[PDB]
Structure formats: structure tokens, C-alpha cells
Amino acid sequence: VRRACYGVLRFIMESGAKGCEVVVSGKLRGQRAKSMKFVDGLMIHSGDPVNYYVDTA
């Protein structure tokens, strides 16, 4: 999961963006669920402009 996310996050910055953040959560490793957040660049969350500044999936 981490190795794949590194290639994805690298490719997004390769194509050209101000920042990117990926969060993968669930039944990773053992039974207890955990979340991994690879975040880089700039990433705002508050206000009106986040509506048209982010691509969320």
C-alpha cells in the first residue's frame, strides 16, 4: 500500500500540481484498522475557495 501510494503521489507532482494528499484506511496489516496519510505540497481545507481548488475522489 505504501509502495503504490509513493508512485501515485510522485506521479501527481510529476504532472504538475501545487500539492496532494492521499489517505488510505481500513484493515491494513492486522485486525486493528489503521490510516496512512501521505501529504505533500500545499493543501488548504477552509473557506469557500476549497470548493474549486481541490479534486476529491
Partner RNA sequence: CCGAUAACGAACGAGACUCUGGCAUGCUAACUAGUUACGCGACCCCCGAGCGGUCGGCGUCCCCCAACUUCUUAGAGGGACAAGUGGCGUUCAGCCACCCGAGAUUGAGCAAUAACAGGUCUGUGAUGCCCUUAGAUGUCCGGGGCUGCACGCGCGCUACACUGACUGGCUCAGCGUGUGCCUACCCUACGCCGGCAGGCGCGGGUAACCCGUUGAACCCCAUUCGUGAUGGGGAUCGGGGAUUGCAAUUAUUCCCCAUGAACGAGGAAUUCCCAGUAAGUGCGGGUCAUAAGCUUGCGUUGAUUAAGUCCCUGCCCUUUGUACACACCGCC
Give contact residues for Mg ion (rule: CB under 5 A).
46
Smallest distance from Mg ion to CB 47, Å: 5
SS3 (DSSP) at 3: helix
Smallest distance from RNA to CB 49, Å: 5
Candidate residues 46, 55, 56, 57; the one interacting with RNA per rule CB under 7 A = 46
Q: Which of residues 9-38 bind RNA (CB under 7 A)?
A: 32, 35, 37
Instruction: Confirm or reject binding of residue 56 to RNA (CB under 7 A).
Output: no
Q: Which amino acid is at 56?
A: T
Q: The C-alpha cell of 42 is what?
A: 500545499
Segment holding 12, helix H or strand E:
helix 2-15
Place of cell 490510516: 35
